[PDB]
Design a protein that fits this description.
The chain contains 13 helices and nine strands. With 302 residues, it is α/β, with parallel strands linked by helices. It has an eight-stranded parallel β-barrel, surrounded by six helices. Helix 1 packs parallel to helix 13 and helix 7 packs parallel to helix 9. It is classed as hydrolase.
Length: 302
């Protein structure tokens, strides 16, 4: 654990939190638990709340891992971002096999309602729909889009709102890091349209899985995302190949510069445990010591 807490410091700047992705396998080894307890104020389950883990068989839910994380977060006063309710990846075969509109609709609604109800009132935000956009801005042709139609997004959000009105509902996606990139501009216009039609989209989550030098672009991209008019926007899965202090600081400033940006979540604690470890993209090294990027953020926030 670092003496200076990025979460405490970002809170002092007026933001809600600075968190990290994690799960039972992380919290039970190394210095993960201690580091998160001292330097972060929010956690996102890396995999324990996904469809493949929570409902491997229809109507047969498994909350073992999810419960572990939620209980640990509450016991340690950390905010939680549910992740993720509707996503084409890590999707059980029994779901993708459904070709009937009514069937899939009811299945999607039950999955959403069941998970959100179990943790009702204990989740700050939920990534209701994840990666629903193609790189060109069109809607990704997933089993949900092909079987339910474009209405699946509005339905997912309306269903989530009803399950737990306390949680902020987010649509989450990657490659929303450049203001001139097609995807960025598209999600903004579609979210504007959905909200205008009454869809309860409280926020836009920008994964922000960056390559070296892409931090600079976020300075213009985040404000653009905020122009969609959602009450919130957030950096949800930040990591940067190379872990350059310049890229990390740029992303932090981007959020500081955006009034509606409530916080930042980095995708993991120590490099060896990153899902992109080959690029040592995190803020703590293999020895679980703060890297130059961590100190740079602290220095920026102070």
């Amino acid at each position: 654990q670092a003496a200076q807490s990025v979460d405490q410091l970002i809170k002092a700047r007026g933001k809600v939190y600075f968190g990290v992705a994690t799960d039972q396998n992380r919290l039970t080894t190394g210095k993960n638990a201690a580091i998160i307890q001292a330097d972060f104020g929010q956690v996102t389950p890396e995999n324990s709340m996904k469809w493949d883990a929570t409902e491997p068989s229809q109507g047969n839910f498994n909350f073992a891992g999810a419960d572990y994380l939620v209980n640990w977060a509450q016991q340690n006063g950390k905010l939680i971002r549910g992740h993720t309710l509707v996503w084409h990846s890590q999707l059980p075969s029994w779901v993708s096999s459904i070709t009937d509109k009514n069937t899939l609709t009811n299945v999607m609604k039950n999955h959403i309602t069941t998970l959100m109800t179990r943790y009702k009132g204990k989740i700050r935000a939920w990534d209701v729909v994840n990666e629903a956009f193609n790189e060109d801005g069109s809607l990704r042709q997933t089993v949900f889009l092909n079987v339910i139609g474009e209405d699946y997004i509005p339905i997912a959000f309306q269903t989530a709102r009803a399950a737990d009105p306390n949680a902020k509902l987010y649509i989450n996606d990657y490659n929303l890091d450049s203001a001139s990139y097609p995807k960025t501009q598209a999600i903004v216009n579609r979210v504007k349209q959905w909200r205008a039609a009454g869809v309860p989209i409280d926020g836009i989550g920008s994964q922000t899985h960056l390559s070296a030098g892409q931090g600079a672009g976020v300075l213009q991209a985040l404000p653009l995302l905020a122009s969609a008019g959602t009450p919130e926007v957030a950096i949800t899965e930040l990591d940067v190949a190379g872990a350059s202090p310049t890229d990390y600081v740029n992303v932090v400033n981007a959020c500081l510069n955006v009034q509606s940006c409530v916080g930042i979540t980095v995708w993991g604690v120590a490099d060896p445990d990153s899902w992109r470890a080959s690029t040592t993209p995190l803020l703590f090294d293999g020895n679980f010591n703060p890297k130059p990027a961590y100190n740079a953020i602290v220095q920026d926030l102070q």
